[PDB]
Amino acid sequence: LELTQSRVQKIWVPVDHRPSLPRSCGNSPTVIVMVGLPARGKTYISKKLTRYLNWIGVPTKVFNVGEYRREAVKQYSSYNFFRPDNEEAMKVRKQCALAALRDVKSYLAKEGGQIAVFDATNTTRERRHMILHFAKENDFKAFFIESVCDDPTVVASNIMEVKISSPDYKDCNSAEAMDDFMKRISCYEASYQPLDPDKCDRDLSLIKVIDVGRRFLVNRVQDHIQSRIVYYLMNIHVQPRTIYLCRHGENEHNLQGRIGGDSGLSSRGKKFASALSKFVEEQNLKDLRVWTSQLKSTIQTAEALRLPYEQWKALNEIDAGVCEELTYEEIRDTYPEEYALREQDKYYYRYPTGESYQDLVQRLEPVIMELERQENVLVICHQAVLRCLLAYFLDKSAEEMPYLKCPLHTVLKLTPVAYGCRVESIYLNVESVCTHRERS
Amino acid sequence: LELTQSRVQKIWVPVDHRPSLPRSCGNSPTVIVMVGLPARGKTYISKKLTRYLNWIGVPTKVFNVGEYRREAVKQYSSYNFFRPDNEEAMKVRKQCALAALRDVKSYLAKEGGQIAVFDATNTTRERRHMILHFAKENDFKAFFIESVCDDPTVVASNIMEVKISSPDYKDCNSAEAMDDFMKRISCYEASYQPLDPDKCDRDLSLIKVIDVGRRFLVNRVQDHIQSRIVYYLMNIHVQPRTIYLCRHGENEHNLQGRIGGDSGLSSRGKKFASALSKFVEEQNLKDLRVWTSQLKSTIQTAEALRLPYEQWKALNEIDAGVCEELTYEEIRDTYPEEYALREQDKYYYRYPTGESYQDLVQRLEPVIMELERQENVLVICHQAVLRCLLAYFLDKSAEEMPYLKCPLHTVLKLTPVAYGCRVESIYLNVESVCTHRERS
Ligand SMILES: N#Cc1c[nH]c2ccc(Oc3ccc(NC(=O)CN)cc3)cc12
Ligand SMILES: N#Cc1c[nH]c2ccc(Oc3ccc(NC(=O)CN)cc3)cc12
Ligand SMILES: O=P(O)(O)OC[C@H]1O[C@](O)(CO)[C@@H](O)[C@@H]1O
Ligand SMILES: O=P(O)(O)OC[C@H]1O[C@](O)(CO)[C@@H](O)[C@@H]1O
Numbered sequence: 001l002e003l004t005q006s007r008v009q010k011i012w013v014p015v016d017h018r019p020s021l022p023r024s025c026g027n028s029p030t031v032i033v034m035v036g037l038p039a040r041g042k043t044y045i046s047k048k049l050t051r052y053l054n055w056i057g058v059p060t061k062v063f064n065v066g067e068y069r070r071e072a073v074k075q076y077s078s079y080n081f082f083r084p085d086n087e088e089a090m091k092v093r094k095q096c097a098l099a100a101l102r103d104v105k106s107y108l109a110k111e112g113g114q115i116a117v118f119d120a121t122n123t124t125r126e127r128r129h130m131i132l133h134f135a136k137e138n139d140f141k142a143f144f145i146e147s148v149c150d151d152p153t154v155v156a157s158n159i160m161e162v163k164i165s166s167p168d169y170k171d172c173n174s175a176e177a178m179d180d181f182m183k184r185i186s187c188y189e190a191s192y193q194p195l196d197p198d199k200c201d202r203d204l205s206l207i208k209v210i211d212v213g214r215r216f217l218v219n220r221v222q223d224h225i226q227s228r229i230v231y232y233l234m235n236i237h238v239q240p241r242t243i244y245l246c247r248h249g250e251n252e253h254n255l256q257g258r259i260g261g262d263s264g265l266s267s268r269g270k271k272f273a274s275a276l277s278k279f280v281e282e283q284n285l286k287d288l289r290v291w292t293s294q295l296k297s298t299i300q301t302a303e304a305l306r307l308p309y310e311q312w313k314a315l316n317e318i319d320a321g322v323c324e325e326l327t328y329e330e331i332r333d334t335y336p337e338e339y340a341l342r343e344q345d346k347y348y349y350r351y352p353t354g355e356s357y358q359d360l361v362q363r364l365e366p367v368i369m370e371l372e373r374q375e376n377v378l379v380i381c382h383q384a385v386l387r388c389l390l391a392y393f394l395d396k397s398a399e400e401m402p403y404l405k406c407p408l409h410t411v412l413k414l415t416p417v418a419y420g421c422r423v424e425s426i427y428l429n430v431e432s433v434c435t436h437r438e439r440s
Numbered sequence: 441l442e443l444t445q446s447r448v449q450k451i452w453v454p455v456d457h458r459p460s461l462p463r464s465c466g467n468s469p470t471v472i473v474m475v476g477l478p479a480r481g482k483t484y485i486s487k488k489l490t491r492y493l494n495w496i497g498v499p500t501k502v503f504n505v506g507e508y509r510r511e512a513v514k515q516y517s518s519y520n521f522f523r524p525d526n527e528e529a530m531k532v533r534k535q536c537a538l539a540a541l542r543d544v545k546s547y548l549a550k551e552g553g554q555i556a557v558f559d560a561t562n563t564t565r566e567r568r569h570m571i572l573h574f575a576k577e578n579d580f581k582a583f584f585i586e587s588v589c590d591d592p593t594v595v596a597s598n599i600m601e602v603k604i605s606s607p608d609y610k611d612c613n614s615a616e617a618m619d620d621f622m623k624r625i626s627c628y629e630a631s632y633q634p635l636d637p638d639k640c641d642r643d644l645s646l647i648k649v650i651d652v653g654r655r656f657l658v659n660r661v662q663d664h665i666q667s668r669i670v671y672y673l674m675n676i677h678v679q680p681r682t683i684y685l686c687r688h689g690e691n692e693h694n695l696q697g698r699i700g701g702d703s704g705l706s707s708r709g710k711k712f713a714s715a716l717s718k719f720v721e722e723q724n725l726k727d728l729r730v731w732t733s734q735l736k737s738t739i740q741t742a743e744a745l746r747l748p749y750e751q752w753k754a755l756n757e758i759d760a761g762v763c764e765e766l767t768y769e770e771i772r773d774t775y776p777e778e779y780a781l782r783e784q785d786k787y788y789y790r791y792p793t794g795e796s797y798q799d800l801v802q803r804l805e806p807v808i809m810e811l812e813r814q815e816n817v818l819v820i821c822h823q824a825v826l827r828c829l830l831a832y833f834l835d836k837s838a839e840e841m842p843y844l845k846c847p848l849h850t851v852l853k854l855t856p857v858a859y860g861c862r863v864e865s866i867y868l869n870v871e872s873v874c875t876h877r878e879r880s
Contacts, residue, residue, distance in 0.1 A: 001710060001740040011751065012739045197655060215637060218656040221674055224813060231671040234661055262793075270441060299452045300441040311451065313799060324793070353702075353764070359753060373664060 008341055009358075010350040029108035030225060031135050032117040033128065035146035035195060038185050039158040041212070042147055045233075046119040047419045049145075052232055055392045056365060057358070058225065059113045063104050065120035068096035076168040079183035084191065097127070101134050108140060115225070116140075123192040125200065132204075143226050144206035145233075146195045154212055155185070162418050212238055232369070241375035242285070243393070243414035243421075245386055248297035249273045250408050250432040253325070257433070260317060260324035265300045268432055272409040273304035275428035279411060280305055280378065288376045291315065291367075298380040309380075314363050317382035321354025328437070343440050346402035357402050360388045368392055383435055386412075393421045403439055408432035448781055449798075450790040469548035470665060471575050472557040473568065475586035475635060478625050479598040481652070482587055485673075486559040487859045489585075492672055495832045496805060497798070498665065499553045503544050505560035508536035516608040519623035524631065537567070541574050548580060555665070556580075563632040565640065572644075583666050584646035585673075586635045594652055595625070602858050652678055672809070681815035682725070683833070683854035683861075685826055688737035689713045690848050690872040693765070697873070700757060700764035705740045708872055712849040713744035715868035719851060720745055720818065728816045731755065731807075738820040749820075754803050757822035761794025768877070783880050786842035797842050800828045808832055823875055826852075833861045843879055848872035 002015040032049070034042040046062045053060040070076070072092055081089045097120060107113040122128055128144075135142040149155070159181050163169070169177035195201045195208055197219035207230055208217035216234065221227050249269030253261045265273065280288070290307050292298040293315035302309040323331050323338070332339040335352075342349040350356040355363075364385065371377060371389075379389065383406055391401040393414055406412070409432050413424040442455040472489070474482040486502045493500040510516070512532055521529045537560060547553040562568055568584075575582040589595070599621050603609070609617035635641045635648055637659035647670055648657035656674065661667050689709030693701045705713065720728070730747050732738040733755035742749040763771050763778070772779040775792075782789040790796040795803075804825065811817060811829075819829065823846055831841040833854055846852070849872050853864040 001705065001713065001743045003704075003736060003740060003743070005736075011734065012736045014743060214660060216656070216658040218658065218674065220654060224810070227671070227674055227813070230674060231667070234658065234667055234670060264443075265441065273441065294451065296443060296445075296452045300443060303441045303443070303454060313802070362753070370664065373667070 007337075008345050008349050009356065010352065027223075028139060028141050029113065030115050030141040030143055031104060031108070031131065032115060032229075033122055033131055033142060033144045034117065034119045035122045035128070035144055036148065037123065037188050037192060038121065039155045039163060039181065040147040040149055041158060041209075041238075042121075042145075043119055044162070044419060045145060045147060045209070046117045048236065049229060049232065050115075050117055051392070051395045051420075052368070053115055053225075053229075054395075054397075055368075056228075056361065057398075058115055060115040060117065061107055061113055062117045062119050063100040063107075065093070065097050065100050065118075068100050069093060070167060072096055072099075079180050079187060082184050082187040084187060101131070105134075105138055109138065121188055123188055125193045141222065142205065143222075143229070144195060144201075144204055145209065145229075146206065147209045148194060149211055151211065165418075207233060209233060232372070235369050236372045239375060241377075241416070242283075243371060243376075243416075244280075244283075244378040245389060245412040245414065246276065246301075246378070246380055246410065247382055247386055247406060247408055248293075248295070248301045248380055249276070249430075251297040254408065254433050254435060257327045257329070258325055259328070259331075260320040262295050262297075264296050268409075268430055269297065269301070270304070272428055272430040272432070273301045275409070275430050276301060276411070277305045279426065279428055280307070285376045288378055289374055290378045290380070292380045293317065293382060293385070295382070298382070301380045305378075312367060314367050315379070315381045315385055318357070318360055318384035319351065319354040321351040323351050323354065346439070347398045357384065357388060357398070360384060364388050364392075394423065395420060405436055408435065447777075448785050448789050449796065450792065467663075468579060468581050469553065470555050470581040470583055471544060471548070471571065472555060472669075473562055473571055473582060473584045474557065474559045475562045475568070475584055476588065477563065477628050477632060478561065479595045479603060479621065480587040480589055481598060481649075481678075482561075482585075483559055484602070484859060485585060485587060485649070486557045488676065489669060489672065490555075490557055491832070491835045491860075492808070493555055493665075493669075494835075494837075495808075496668075496801065497838075498555055500555040500557065501547055501553055502557045502559050503540040503547075505533070505537050505540050505558075508540050509533060510607060512536055512539075519620050519627060522624050522627040524627060541571070545574075545578055549578065561628055563628055565633045581662065582645065583662075583669070584635060584641075584644055585649065585669075586646065587649045588634060589651055591651065605858075647673060649673060672812070675809050676812045679815060681817075681856070682723075683811060683816075683856075684720075684723075684818040685829060685852040685854065686716065686741075686818070686820055686850065687822055687826055687846060687848055688733075688735070688741045688820055689716070689870075691737040694848065694873050694875060697767045697769070698765055699768070699771075700760040702735050702737075704736050708849075708870055709737065709741070710744070712868055712870040712872070713741045715849070715870050716741060716851070717745045719866065719868055720747070725816045728818055729814055730818045730820070732820045733757065733822060733825070735822070738822070741820045745818075752807060754807050755819070755821045755825055758797070758800055758824035759791065759794040761791040763791050763794065786879070787838045797824065797828060797838070800824060804828050804832075834863065835860060845876055848875065 003012045004015050005012055034046055036042050043064065050060045050062050104116040104118060107116050118131065122131065132142055159178050163181050164174050164177040195206055197206060197217060205220045205222050205226060210216065218230055221230060249272035250266045251269055252263040252266055255266055288307065290302055290305060290309035292302045292309050292311050294311045294313050295316055299311065323335065347357045386406040387401055387404040390404050390406065390412065396404060409428050409430045411426040411428065413426060415422040443452045444455050445452055474486055476482050483504065490500045490502050520526065544556040544558060547556050558571065562571065572582055599618050603621050604614050604617040635646055637646060637657060645660045645662050645666060650656065658670055661670060689712035690706045691709055692703040692706055695706055728747065730742055730745060730749035732742045732749050732751050734751045734753050735756055739751065763775065787797045826846040827841055827844040830844050830846065830852065836844060849868050849870045851866040851868065853866060855862040
């Protein structure tokens with residue numbers, strides 16, 4: 001039972017003594033079907049879910065039928081394009097949906113994609129029967145996500161927040177765009193057949209998000225990924241809030257250029273901790289949850305706030321294994337092969353008896369799920385942990401993630417707006433060393 | 441910002457220089473309300489959910505009204521006790537429910553309990569209004585779990601599996617007990633008012649488990665624990681299956697009495713791996729998922745099976761930190777304080793730069809959730825990991841968990857039956873060292 005440890009990821013694999021003529025061999029993908037009237041947050045759900053799935057390592061892509069339409073029909077004039085009696089535009093819209101499905105097939109069967117989010121109204125049983133036929137013929141699973149809401153306040157808010165600012169309404173003022181969009185919604189209301197898990201859609205795998213996540217109808221969750229999506233949708237919310245992310249104040253290891261360890265705050269780190277308390281106070285937040293790692297430097301930083309805080313072992317810095325408490329110079333001199341391997345593949349590289357950024361993502365997933373549930377949160381953590389969390393909020397790839405700039409004594413203020421996060425950086429005017437290292 | 445590291449758990453806490461007269465200060469608990477007709481799996485849900493919640497560290501207890509009734513009324517005669525026209529038994533049954541609620545108040549407000557599972561029919565709005573009044577007056581949260589099923593095959597199967605074997609039917613044969621139980625169910629059908637999240641129960645936090653988990657109605661999930669319960673209920677199933685748990689075959693570190701590391705199989709370990717393949721083959725399982733850790737010894741064991749397997753970093757043995765690759769004699773001689781601290785508090789003890797059994801539980805929770813989703817699974821792991829998983833399946837406490845017997849070259853065959861697991865041990869007749877150490 002001869003095994004070898006892969007140099008980058010440190011995975012034990014069978015020793016592969018390929019024969020004279022080495023031969024390469026060259027689970028089922030899922031089509032997530034968005035369902036609902038316009039301004040029901042389908043694009044918001046599509047984008048957020050795709051961001052989460054990609055971050056956890058499930059290759060996911062959104063196919064928005066409206067973008068195929070904006071490409072086929074140069075400029076948008078009015079709701080008249082969406083009229084059920086508009087024979088020509090109805091043909092164009094069908095062609096756009098079919099062209100998106102063609103790209104869904106290519107993504108899942110030929111590009112290594114695992115999940116395709118089909119972002120359209122898909123309000124009629126006919127359209128959904130056609131998507132099911134497409135899924136069955138291509139051996140793709142189908143999972144439906146319907147967003148149902150009758151509240152006019154919610155509809156008006158969605159139009160104001162992200163519809164009026166759509167490329168379709170570039171030449172329009174807020175009032176014209178709102179009026180045109182209401183008429184556009186009305187075009188879909190007559191033919192709209194909601195999902196019926198009771199009789200018609202009984203055998204379909206679906207989630208009905210009712211009244212902006214107040215209630216859920218979950219039918220036939222087949223697998224792990226659908227179960228995860230359902231859990232995610234139940235944990236996220238659209239309530240306004242702020243996420244503050246920062247590292248512990250400068251520590252003794254930072255001064256010596258040493259990685260890992262459990263060293264305490266330097267004199268400057270203690271100054272940052274005081275500066276952070278003043279900053280937090282000036283934010284005047286009704287309630288604020290404070291999260292730290294179990295490492296001393298983040299706890300000492302939180303201690304300066306005089307606020308209750310919760311320690312998470314999942315927030316502990318990346319484990320450097322045998323390289324813990326060493327400087328990067330000592331790593332290069334004692335472990336040159338290891339140093340070069342990491343520089344070449346920073347995301348997947350695992351330290352011996354240690355971790356990779358890939359392991360960090362797996363550890364941080366419960367942190368992300370809890371961050372989603374919460375409102376105002378301050379996370380006091382570490383450089384690699386912060387890059388991973390930031391890659392989730394900022395939709396950064398696995399390749400970009402180990403190189404994100406997360407300086408010491410700097411708060412990253414995250415405000416959820418439109419289809420992602422607005423990021424503000426706040427340097428708290430306390431000197432520190434620089435721990436950022438660019439690629440080679 | 442002076443901190444000290446707690447000796448057992450290794451948690452950084454503010455240095456507590458208590459004044460001359462040290463003063464001690466001396467989230468809201470939840471009442472989970474089971475709802476539904478008899479033989480709807482309410483006790484099955486109650487017990488399984490309690491087992492999971494306790495294992496993850498949420499103190500949980502079941503209060504079954506029927507057990508209070510068996511205590512108040514010595515012997516059970518027939519369904520006549522459950523008649524709606526039985527004035528005396530109706531008073532007794534109410535007294536029993538009130539006595540259970542009294543014990544719910546004492547458990548949550550005075551015993552450090554976090555979750556009380558109120559296991560009764562609670563089929564009428566009147567009973568549920570009374571439970572809500574009790575929850576509001578005691579500042580307890582209320583979360584309803586209703587099990588709805590109209591399938592007579594499911595009802596008959598439940599009566600045959602766990603009702604006929606109830607202490608109520610000790611003097612009865614299978615046919616008498618089944619007949620009496622059907623009449624007993626009928627006593628509840630007239631007054632049964634299902635949960636109505638649409639109109640009446642709109643503001644209640646609830647889950648409706650429809651048709652043995654085929655469908656779910658989820659209303660107003662308020663917090664983290666309710667969200668976790670909902671996710672758990674969506675991942676478990678009642679399909680028949682087998683869980684096989686074993687350790688890797690004996691390794692080189694086992695022979696030297698060394699802890700941790702990433703050593704390979706000894707000659708005996710390789711013999712076990714072959715013996716395991718023969719055992720697996722003899723089980724004649726249509727499909728079998730094989731899970732290993734990322735450590736060499738478990739992968740080499742799986743390699744002998746000639747079956748596809750999946751490596752989980754979450755299955756890696758407990759991290760001994762600074763004590764890794766040391767013998768227990770070398771631990772006692774180099775770290776005597778650490779050795780004695782662990783012996784005194786084996787569950788909570790954290791190795792320096794390492795883990796506790798408490799950390800293992802947190803790491804293994806996604807493993808447990810996936811084990812629940814799956815059918816036939818073989819987990820090839822390590823001594824401490826195995827004790828943790830076994831404590832989940834066998835409902836063992838945190839205190840018992842570090843001392844569970846998990847010998848090498850022995851398969852633990854777990855068969856879900858009634859309200860837990862039947863455990864069969866299969867020694868594969870290959871000698872090894874003993875790594876079990878009893879408490880002192
Ligand atoms: N209708 C409608 C919506 C308008 N904007 C939205 C944004 C998101 C959206 O979808 C979700 C909203 C809420 C949740 N979950 C929860 O609120 C559970 N706490 C999940 C998805 C619906 C709409
Ligand atoms: N009615 C009825 C039941 C009879 N025995 C049962 C055992 C468990 C039970 O509750 C659950 C069954 C199933 C699930 N979940 C799933 O099957 C999702 N895969 C959750 C709870 C209902 C009944
Ligand atoms: O992935 P990188 O760039 O080495 O950064 C992670 C490192 O940053 C630090 O947080 C500070 O230098 C170390 O403890 C950790 O090893
Ligand atoms: O908690 P205990 O009894 O020390 O057992 C855990 C130990 O068992 C082993 O799996 C085998 O000795 C070690 O690798 C590990 O440290």
